[PDB]
Write a protein that binds this ligand. Structure first.
Ligand SMILES: OC[C@H]1O[C@H](O[C@H]2[C@H](O)[C@@H](O)[C@@H](O)O[C@@H]2CO)[C@H](O)[C@@H](O)[C@@H]1O
Length: 477
């Protein structure tokens, strides 16, 4: 990256203009040009370019991605003075801590809220279960009850978690990578309710961020689910909106994943000192956070002086209320696998590509074991089992044994990708040297038209703990 300059990346839904204004100030003072960019899928792109010694000097994202970045050595250690550490809440500092070290600067606390149109809906429902009835009444008036982004599992997670779904279990002061809550009865209940909403045409499976934002901000739908950053665009619309607690599900609160917007410094940056100067003495100040927050709201900011003011904003109060009912995202590397697994499951269940159970079973195995099974509807074309580990530190799977119909075979966990072919029985290549064969077919009690094939996997963790997974493929008779 170019020395004597600063390149900053932040997501497109954020306050980049304000940040840019702060950049202008920094440039005017120090003569150092600050450039802000908002690449698409930057959370995926940053680790790719940063590994080559390229990319931005500073990267902005919620804290959950930063452990993965730190594990691969893509981030410089942050060592601020105590005086500056005092300026920010310790909670937000804890969010950016990885293996004892501070890997970023905390900026603001983010949580989803229920956003509603006061003119259409003076009293929004307090439960998910009421949305269908409400939708029927609004559909008669040429409107809909609720629209939100179904393409990102972040927005559906609050519902999935309400009845007891969870990412990784938290015991004492650390997360248990071995204990994943994607497949439990609660998660199934919540995802099932979502799919039921889609089945009854209360919502569309193809709805994304822009469609939901447009629908709500033009007054076509009575409610949406979004974060603080979204408010400024609504202010621009003609909608008088409230921001309130997410609806309960089965009598329990929705549990959004709480993010902490964080600014990391690329380990490949020559400009680190300049980045520290900018972040500490410019970006994190009443003025800088004022600029960014004015552009797009940050939620509850990490800076105490500004937060003291912000608490007066009821939208922020609603944000914090929802946050208190949710859970701070883990920052561990495995979160990358978790998010990918749940994203796939929601899209597949919502679109009708998989049942809720199958989708969440596959998501479970992917999130826990880094195992993906690519099925083919055509039995003659065999399945592919894929292992793609993202966690190389701490408790990890050391040894992996796949149990096929025809025997056991070992599979290594190294850094890279490991793929094997899984065969359906009765195929021409079913019995050949080195072939791993499915167990099945098994009859599906709900659908007579479908057959289930399965393989089992035994996992030996570095601490000696055994665990077991299974992966299924479903095929039409
Ligand atoms: O959808 C999975 C996604 O969830 C979170 O991303 C949020 C981000 O935290 C918010 O600041 C805002 O931009 O919306 C994003 C979802 O569209 C996680 O931080 C991210 O790792 C994960 O992929």
């Amino acid at each position: 990256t170019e020395e004597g300059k600063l390149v900053i990346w932040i997501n497109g839904d954020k306050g980049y203009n304000g940040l840019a204004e702060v950049g202008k100030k920094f440039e005017k003072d120090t003569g150092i040009k600050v450039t802000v960019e908002h690449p698409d899928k930057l959370e995926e792109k940053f680790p790719q370019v940063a590994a080559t010694g390229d990319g931005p000097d500073i990267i902005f994202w919620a804290h959950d991605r930063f452990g993965g970045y730190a594990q691969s050595g893509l981030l410089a250690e942050i060592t601020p003075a105590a005086a500056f550490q005092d300026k920010l809440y310790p909670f937000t500092w804890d969010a950016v801590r990885y293996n004892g070290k501070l890997i970023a600067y905390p900026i603001a606390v983010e949580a989803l809220s229920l956003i509603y149109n006061k003119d259409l809906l003076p009293n929004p429902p307090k439960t998910w279960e009421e949305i269908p009835a409400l939708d029927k009444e609004l559909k008669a008036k040429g409107k809909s009850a609720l629209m939100f982004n179904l393409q990102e599992p972040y927005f559906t997670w609050p519902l999935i978690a309400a009845d007891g779904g969870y990412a990784f279990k938290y015991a004492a002061g650390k997360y248990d990578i071995k204990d994943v809550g994607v497949d439990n009865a609660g998660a199934k209940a919540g995802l099932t309710f979502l799919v039921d909403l889609i089945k009854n045409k209360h919502m569309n499976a193809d709805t994304d961020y822009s469609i939901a934002e447009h629908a709500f901000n033009h007054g076509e739908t009575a409610m949406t689910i979004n974060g603080p950053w979204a408010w400024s665009n609504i202010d621009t619309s003609a909608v008088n909106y409230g921001v309130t607690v997410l609806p309960t599900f089965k009598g329990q609160p929705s549990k959004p994943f709480v993010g902490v917007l964080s600014a990391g410094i690329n380990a490949a940056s020559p400009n680190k000192e300049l980045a520290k100067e900018f972040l500490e003495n410019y970006l994190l100040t009443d003025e800088g956070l004022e600029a960014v927050n004015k552009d797009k709201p940050l939620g509850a900011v990490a800076l105490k002086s500004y937060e003291e003011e912000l608490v007066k904003d009821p939208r922020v109060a609603a944000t914090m209320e929802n946050a208190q009912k949710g859970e701070i995202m883990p920052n561990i590397p495995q979160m990358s696998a978790f998010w990918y697994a749940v994203r796939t499951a929601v899209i597949n269940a919502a679109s009708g590509r998989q049942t809720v159970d199958a989708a969440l079973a596959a998501a479970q195995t992917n999130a826990a074991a880094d195992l993906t099974l690519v099925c083919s509807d055509d039995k003659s074309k065999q399945a592919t089992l894929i292992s793609y580990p993202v966690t190389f530190k701490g408790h990890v799977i050391k040894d992996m044994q796949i149990f096929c119909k025809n025997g056991w075979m070992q599979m290594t966990r190294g850094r890279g990708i490991n793929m094997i072919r899984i065969h359906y029985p009765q195929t021409y290549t079913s019995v050949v040297p080195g072939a791993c064969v499915f167990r099945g077919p098994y009859s599906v009690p709900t659908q007579d038209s479908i057959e289930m094939y399965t393989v089992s996997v035994a996992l030996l963790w570095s601490d000696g703990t055994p665990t077991y997974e299974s992966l299924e493929c479903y095929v039409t008779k």
